[PDB]
Design a protein around this motif. Structure first.
Motif, PDB file in Angstrom:
ATOM      1  N   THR A  48       0.775  -1.226   0.000  1.00 38.19           N
ATOM      2  CA  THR A  48       0.000   0.000   0.000  1.00 38.19           C
ATOM      3  C   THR A  48       0.806   1.274   0.000  1.00 38.19           C
ATOM      4  O   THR A  48       0.307   2.324  -0.378  1.00 38.19           O
ATOM      5  N   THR A  49       2.041   1.177   0.439  1.00 36.98           N
ATOM      6  CA  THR A  49       2.892   2.332   0.526  1.00 36.98           C
ATOM      7  C   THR A  49       3.704   2.534  -0.725  1.00 36.98           C
ATOM      8  O   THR A  49       4.664   3.289  -0.736  1.00 36.98           O
ATOM      9  N   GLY A  50       3.340   1.836  -1.778  1.00 36.59           N
ATOM     10  CA  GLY A  50       4.067   1.994  -3.027  1.00 36.59           C
ATOM     11  C   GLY A  50       4.847   0.739  -3.428  1.00 36.59           C
ATOM     12  O   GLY A  50       4.245  -0.260  -3.805  1.00 36.59           O
ATOM     13  N   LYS A  51       6.188   0.816  -3.400  1.00 31.58           N
ATOM     14  CA  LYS A  51       7.057  -0.300  -3.782  1.00 31.58           C
ATOM     15  C   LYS A  51       7.652  -0.993  -2.565  1.00 31.58           C
ATOM     16  O   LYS A  51       8.167  -0.352  -1.659  1.00 31.58           O
ATOM     17  N   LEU A  52       7.568  -2.311  -2.555  1.00 31.14           N
ATOM     18  CA  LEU A  52       8.092  -3.125  -1.474  1.00 31.14           C
ATOM     19  C   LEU A  52       9.639  -3.036  -1.413  1.00 31.14           C
ATOM     20  O   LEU A  52      10.330  -3.286  -2.388  1.00 31.14           O
TER      21      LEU A  52
END
Length: 225
Positions: A48-52
């Protein structure tokens, strides 16, 4: 059993993880279904915060063993289901050979009719240029045996196992898991005799998904008895 009845059909699953790896904060949400009758799992995860910041494969074991298929003869050994619906705490330390380690704490339980896995993950001592942070792991996964032993003193179980992550160069990244589970409530649980779970997983991607994700399919069955 007390929980046995809860797993007769297809159960919706909800996964929430909050993690921090070397100051790299992130969040993952996952949805899926579980069908214990077939030891079958289908989950889709989204960063959810973008890229893992870490490789998806490293989070697999972290992201519900109550969905394992226990053969009729082994039902009395099913600690997982027996703890339901109150749930159990699943704690781990995962040591990546010649690299950092993950420290996780999760709560596995029912929220109404949905099975929930709420996780807090903390990762330290990672090499900014290693296999993990450097994303050198291949997008795949192998089958493994998970050894189960009871923990009388703690009215729970202890699990130990190694995961072998394939590296892009043909090499392997070792991940040693140390796991403890304890019942959340004050209710009884079944303490099992030593046995193991045979786990098989497959990782995929959804062509329609633009966000960074992982689709997971697993089959889990108890054996050794």
């Amino acid at each position: 059993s007390k929980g046995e009845e809860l797993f007769t059909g297809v159960v919706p699953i909800l996964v929430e993880l909050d993690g921090d790896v070397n100051g790299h904060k992130f969040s993952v949400s996952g949805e899926g279904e579980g069908d214990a009758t077939y030891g079958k799992l289908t989950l889709k995860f989204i960063c959810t915060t973008g890229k893992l910041p870490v490789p998806w494969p490293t989070l697999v074991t972290t992201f519900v063993q109550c969905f394992s298929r226990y053969p009729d003869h082994m039902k009395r050994h099913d600690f997982f289901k027996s703890a339901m619906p109150e749930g159990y705490v699943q704690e781990r330390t995962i040591f990546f050979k010649d690299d950092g380690n993950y420290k996780t704490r999760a709560e596995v339980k029912f929220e109404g009719d949905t099975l929930v896995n709420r996780i807090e993950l903390k990762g330290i001592d990672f090499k900014e240029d290693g296999n993990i942070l450097g994303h050198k792991l291949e997008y795949n996964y192998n089958s493994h045996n998970v050894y189960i032993m009871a923990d009388k003193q703690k009215n729970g179980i202890k699990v130990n196992f190694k995961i072998r992550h394939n590296i892009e160069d043909g090499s392997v990244q070792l991940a040693d898991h140390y796991q403890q589970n304890t019942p959340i409530g004050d209710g009884p649980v079944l303490l099992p005799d030593n046995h193991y779970l045979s786990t098989q997983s497959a990782l995929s991607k959804d062509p329609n998904e633009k966000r960074d994700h992982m689709v997971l399919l697993e089959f889990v069955t108890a054996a050794g008895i």
